[PDB]
């Protein structure tokens, strides 16, 4: 039922230390059944936010998670995706790059 | 405050030269009847965006207008509000701080 779609973001790169605030505009989602996933080879972490951070079901403001390597020497590419935990549905991925701090 | 309301923004400060991208979350608005109104003593300006920049009536991504003075030496706080042209309704004001900036091409 329904699909997940990332429409726009304020940024697609951030520090490998995590903690950057991201504004993500999306198609209708359910605040109690939604997450933001970051994935790379041998690594996965969720964006940090609460239900109050989901605005009118069409935008999520969250903080990026720390990357697996806190002392990056060059950019690394990971995928950012919306994920509905109930049915495991995933949105098409968006490129996100973690950078040296 | 009645119906127009700014709920959250990605940043509340930017260059006095304008052009900074702002993500503003708000209560329901009509894309063809809404604007972001900046004001200060004897100065007014509007944020720049297209109707396509209004996301599902509850979010606006816009570029800040340039402040009245590009020679700003110290930060200056101004007001930022949602404004509805049709009935001139205004949201409660949010503070925005313009910051000094330079352009090697402008003297």
DSSP string for residues in B18-74:
---EEEEEES---TTS-EEEEEETTEEEE-B--GGGB-TTSEEEEEPPPPS-TT--S
Q: What residues make up the domain containing A63?
A: 1-101
Matching residue, tokens 């039922």: A1
Taking the CA of residue B49 and the nearest CA in chain A, the distance in Å comes to: 15
Q: Which residues pair with residue A22 across a beta bridge?
A: A62
CA angle, B21 as apex, A61 and A90 as ends, to 5°?
A: 35
What is the distance between the alpha carbons of residues A86 and B8, in angstroms, rounded to a whole number?
28
Question: How far from B57 is each of A66, B4, B12, B54, B60, CA to CA, in Å?
Answer: 33, 12, 21, 6, 8
What is the distance between the alpha carbons of residues A94 and A8, in angstroms, rounded to a whole number?
10
User: CB distance A61–B7 less than 8 Å?
Assistant: no
What is the distance between the alpha carbons of residues A74 and B52, in angstroms, rounded to a whole number?
35
Nearest CA in chain B to A56: B58
Report phi then psi at B87, rounded to 5.
Answer: -115, 15
User: Are A22 and A33 in contact, with CB atoms under 8 Å apart?
Assistant: no
| Among candidates A7, A10, A58 on the partner chain, residue whose Cβ is nearest the Cβ of B10 | A10
Q: Which residues of A17-36 are buried (b: 16+ CB within 10 A; e: fewer)?
A: bbebbbbbbbeebeeeebeb
| Among candidates B23, B58, B61 on the partner chain, residue whose Cβ is nearest the Cβ of A58 | B58
CATH of the domain at B43: 2.60.40.10
Q: Whole-angstrom distance between the N-terminal and C-terminal Cα of chain A?
A: 40
DSSP symbol at A92? P
DSSP symbol at A33? S
The 3-state DSSP class for residue A53 equals helix
Q: Which residues pair with residue B45 across a beta bridge?
A: B38
CA B47 to chain centroid, in Å, comes to 5
Q: Closest by alpha carbon to B96, among B72, B75, B73?
A: B75
A23 contact residues in B (CB cutoff 8 A): 10, 23, 25
| Among candidates B10, B25, B61 on the partner chain, residue whose Cβ is nearest the Cβ of A55 | B25
Q: Report resolution in angstroms.
A: 1.8
Long-range pairs for B42-51: beta carbons < 8 A, 24 or more residues apart:
B43/B67, B43/B68, B43/B78, B47/B22
The 3-state DSSP class for residue B7 equals strand
Q: Which technique was used to obtain these atomic coordinates? A: X-ray
The 3-state DSSP class for residue A51 equals helix
Number of independent structural domains in chain B: 1
């Amino acid at each position: 039922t329904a699909e997940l779609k990332i429409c726009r973001v304020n940024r697609n790169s951030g520090s490998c230390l995590g903690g950057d605030e991201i504004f993500l505009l999306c198609d209708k989602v359910q605040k109690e059944d939604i997450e933001v996933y970051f994935t790379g080879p041998g690594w996965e972490a969720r964006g940090s936010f609460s239900q109050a951070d989901v605005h009118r079901q069409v935008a999520i403001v969250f903080r990026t998670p720390p990357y697996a390597d806190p002392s990056l020497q060059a950019p690394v590419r990971v995928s950012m995706q919306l994920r509905r935990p109930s049915d495991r549905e995933l949105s098409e991925p968006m490129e996100f790059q973690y950078l040296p701090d």
